[PDB]
Amino acid sequence: PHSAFGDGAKAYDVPAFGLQIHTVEHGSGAPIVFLHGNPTSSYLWRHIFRRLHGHGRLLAVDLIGYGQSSKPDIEYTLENQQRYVDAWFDALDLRNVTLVLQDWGAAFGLNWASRNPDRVRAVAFFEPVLRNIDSVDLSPEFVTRRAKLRQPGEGEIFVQQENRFLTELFPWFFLTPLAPEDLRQYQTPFPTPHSRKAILAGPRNLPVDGEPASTVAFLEQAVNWLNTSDTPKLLLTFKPGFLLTDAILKWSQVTIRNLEIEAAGAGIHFVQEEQPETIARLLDAWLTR
């Protein structure tokens, strides 16, 4: 794996339903699992991952559709993606698990936890896909683009043929511009139109103003576990942030149980690139508690 993951980090592929889930690991102890979202991979966690050496067994995955994991010719429904995540957790048979989740990784991580409450120690998340979002609360340029992407054909042209999600939209939504070399690393998984399939499914699956209704329903499944589990939970917030809208922040304070919330400073969305030091520090103090 990449040197930025730190000394003594190894990688390997985890088989699932015929495919491969690429996995970066370091250390030993209680498992700490890092799940990315769209359109990133384990690489997004590298600086946080390295700064967290020795808290336990660090596990960062590339979801199916991303990174060095297989890119099959499936529909990237939430049900299908969840199956592969469930599979990876099965292969590794983990317990006493701390989840550290961001974007879609929050949706899949929380969904897993909710059905596996006995295997979960703690969960930290930020910029999560968590709840229905009000379009008035999101950057309008993203909302408009998403609306275009939900149109048959136009979405595939923008994301898969022209590759503009990766060449335009992705690097725009960084507070601190992303270094050339790092943008190239995020693009290496995606040489072809077909390789980019999961990238388009993301925004189409994202719940905005109630649509799609299947995603509202999928995300609702973890709500009981969130509201009633005693598992310690940590939400980091960012100014201005992106997916964590005030209404969803207020929802989480009002609905989620045993939730600590800490400001982690200036950041938009890919906050692991924006405040890796602050995040790593806040997590480290948290895991110690």
Swiss-Prot record:
Reactions mediated catalytically: 1-haloalkane + H2O = a halide anion + a primary alcohol + H(+)
Enzyme class: hydrolase
GO molecular function, one term: haloalkane dehalogenase activity
UniProt keyword Protein biosynthesis, yes or no: no
Keywords recorded for this protein, A-Z: Hydrolase, Plasmid
EC code(s) of this entry: 3.8.1.5
InterPro entries (UniProt xref): AB_hydrolase_1, AB_hydrolase_fold, Haloalkane_dehalogenase_2
Annotated disulfide bonds: none
SUPFAM superfamilies to which the protein is assigned, alphabetical: alpha/beta-Hydrolases (SSF53474)
Every AB hydrolase-1 domain range: 31-143
UniProt-listed Pfam families: Abhydrolase_1
Gene3D superfamilies: alpha/beta hydrolase (3.40.50.1820)
Residues at the catalytic site: D103, E127, H269
Family label: Belongs to the haloalkane dehalogenase family. Type 2 subfamily.
PANTHER family assigned: EPOXIDE HYDROLASE
Subunit structure: Monomer.
Function: Catalyzes hydrolytic cleavage of carbon-halogen bonds in halogenated aliphatic compounds, leading to the formation of the corresponding primary alcohols, halide ions and protons.
Descriptive protein name: Haloalkane dehalogenase
Gene that specifies this protein: dhaA
